[PDB]
């Protein structure tokens, strides 16, 4: 453990799994703590509305909704169900216990 340091959930990497990075490279847009990838390949203002910015986790979390010309991609941010496990610490408590 002290080398593992602690366990991973399939959870945490919602935009950090491979699929995040496939969607990243296919759109030439990269996670903030995420690596670089050079291109794979190479809009009226009055009629288009901005109330919130199309962010990169946005186009990265729905690649075909938010991106014109997305391709060569596998799937996107699909989430594993939430995990209601918390580390029981001390071996004296019952095996089965209510978390506060």
């Amino acid at each position: 453990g002290q080398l593992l340091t602690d366990f991973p959930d399939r959870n945490y990497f919602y935009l950090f799994e491979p699929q995040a990075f496939v969607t990243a490279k296919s759109l030439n847009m990269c996670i903030p703590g995420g690596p670089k990838f050079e291109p794979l390949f190479r809009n009226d203002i009055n009629k288009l509305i901005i109330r919130s910015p199309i962010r990169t986790e946005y186009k990265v979390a729905f690649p075909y909704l938010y991106n014109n010309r997305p391709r060569k991609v596998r799937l996107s941010v699909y989430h594993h169900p939430m995990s209601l496990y918390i580390k029981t610490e001390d071996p004296d408590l019952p095996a089965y216990y209510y978390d506060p």
Binding site: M29, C30, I31, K36, F37, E38, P39
Partner: peptide
């Protein structure tokens, strides 16, 4: 992150490829 700004490849241009946010933005 790369919220639609700048170089896609920081290889053949001559910088280290870091995109700092403006502390002067408003």
């Amino acid at each position: 992150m790369y919220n639609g700004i700048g170089l896609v490849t920081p290889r053949g241009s001559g910088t280290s490829g870091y995109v700092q946010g403006n502390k002067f933005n408003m």
